[PDB]
Design a protein around this ligand. Structure first.
Ligand SMILES: CCCCCCCCCCCCCCCCCC(=O)OC[C@H](COP(=O)([O-])OCC(O)COP(=O)([O-])OC[C@@H](COC(=O)CCCCCCCCCCCCCCCCC)OC(=O)CCCCCCCCCCCCCCCCC)OC(=O)CCCCCCCCCCCCCCCCC
Ligand SMILES: COC1=C(OC)C(=O)C(C/C=C(\C)CC/C=C(\C)CC/C=C(\C)CC/C=C(\C)CC/C=C(\C)CC/C=C(\C)CC/C=C(\C)CCC=C(C)C)=C(C)C1=O
Ligand SMILES: CCCCCCCCCCCCCCCCCC(=O)OC[C@H](COP(=O)(O)OCCN)OC(=O)CCCCCCCCCCCCCCCCC
Lengths: 59, 148
């Protein structure tokens, strides 16, 4: 059975002011939360790093 | 940093020497210092096993790439950080500094003790340290010697 397909609406709709206005707020909140979580993860990651070793050192 | 600065550099012979009291000294000293790059080989092996499983059961490639990343992520998470390894590294570095100081003292006075050493090796057939033998002798005197 050949599965049916469709043309995604957002690929063929003229850009509108409503999309912009609403997705702007959604992206603002997404950016805020992502920035907070990424800052936490960045602090964790950098603090996880090892200490600098000597030159040509084994173990 | 302070202790490592005092030590300067660490050679594998000393690490293997301290292996007596901490068998995982290399596994701990790798996770404290930026000596070599660590690859999550166990995580990648588990990922390859999951890849073989998926290949057998015909899963989409996205699933197997995700199941390769996931064990790798777990291995990395369980590897990095681990500040206990830093405490063990501090202990090892203290041991190593004491050992190096004593070794330097040995080298500095080696010529002075050559004659006494030559006389001593011919009279005592034991390789045990002088301090231990003298403590044992002191205990032997304190126990058996008549106070008089
Ligand atoms: C598409 C390809 C893209 C490729 C990109 C490749 C990027 C490579 C990056 C390499 C690593 C860079 C690290 C920089 C660290 C900076 C901090 C620092 O120096 O810390 C010193 C650091 C110690 O860190 P720490 O002090 O403990 O804490 C650092 C924290 O960041 C805390 O420090 P802080 O308290 O000072 O923090 C400052 C404060 C500052 O925060 C603020 O106040 C924010 C201000 C923002 C202002 C922005 C203004 C922009 C203007 C826009 C205008 C638009 C106008 C439009 C108009 C339109 C018309 C109207 O917070 C931040 O900085 C926020 C960070 C959190 C980020 C949140 C988002 C994370 C997820 C998204 C990531 C990006 C995705 C992009 C996807 C793109 C897709 C297309 O130690 C060092 O000396 C390290 C130096 C850095 C090198 C590290 C090397 C590690 C190597 C690992 C091996 C693997 C490498 C792989 C490389 C791959 C290359 C391809
Ligand atoms: C709110 O409800 C809604 C929805 O939810 C139900 C929707 O689904 C939708 C539709 C949803 C969709 C079409 C979703 C599918 C499409 C998507 C996700 C496409 C959008 C993708 C993204 C936003 C992610 C990619 C973008 C990024 C990672 C942003 C990266 C930004 C960067 C790097 C910043 C670039 C700019 C700079 C570096 C600034 C350069 C200039 C300077 C620094 C100035 C110089 C400065 C000095 C000091 C000299 C709508 C409209 C809606 O309203
Ligand atoms: C938005 C949605 C998604 C959000 C995701 C959020 C994720 C949160 C994760 C939380 C946990 C964070 C854990 C951080 C561990 C970081 C480890 C790391 O790579 O550190 C860098 C390390 C070298 O660091 P260091 O030894 O300290 O040296 C510098 C010292 N000054 O580097 C090294 O030692 C290099 C070797 C280790 C790293 C190997 C990585 C292998 C990756 C394999 C990928 C396979 C898949 C490929 C797919 C594409 C194929 C075409």
């Amino acid at each position: 059975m050949r599965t049916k397909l469709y043309n995604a609406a957002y690929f063929l709709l003229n850009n509108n002011e409503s999309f912009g206005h609403s997705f702007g707020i959604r992206l603002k909140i997404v950016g805020l939360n992502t920035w907070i979580v990424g800052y936490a993860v960045s602090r964790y990651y950098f603090s996880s790093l090892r200490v600098k070793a000597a030159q040509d050192e084994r173990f | 940093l302070r202790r490592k600065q005092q030590l300067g550099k660490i050679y594998p012979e000393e690490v293997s020497s301290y292996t007596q009291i901490n068998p995982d000294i290399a596994n701990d000293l790798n996770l404290t210092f930026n000596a070599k790059l660590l690859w999550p080989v166990r995580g990648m092996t588990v990922g390859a096993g999951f890849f073989a499983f998926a290949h057998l059961f015909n899963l989409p490639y996205s699933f197997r790439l995700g199941l390769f990343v996931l064990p790798t992520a777990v291995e990395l998470a369980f590897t990095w950080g681990n500040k206990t390894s830093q405490f063990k590294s501090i202990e090892f570095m203290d041991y190593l500094l004491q050992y190096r100081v004593s070794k330097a003292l040995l080298e500095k006075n080696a010529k002075h003790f050559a004659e006494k050493k030559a006389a001593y090796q011919k009279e005592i057939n034991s390789s045990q340290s002088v301090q231990d033998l003298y403590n044992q002798l002191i205990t032997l005197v304190s126990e058996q010697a008549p106070s008089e």
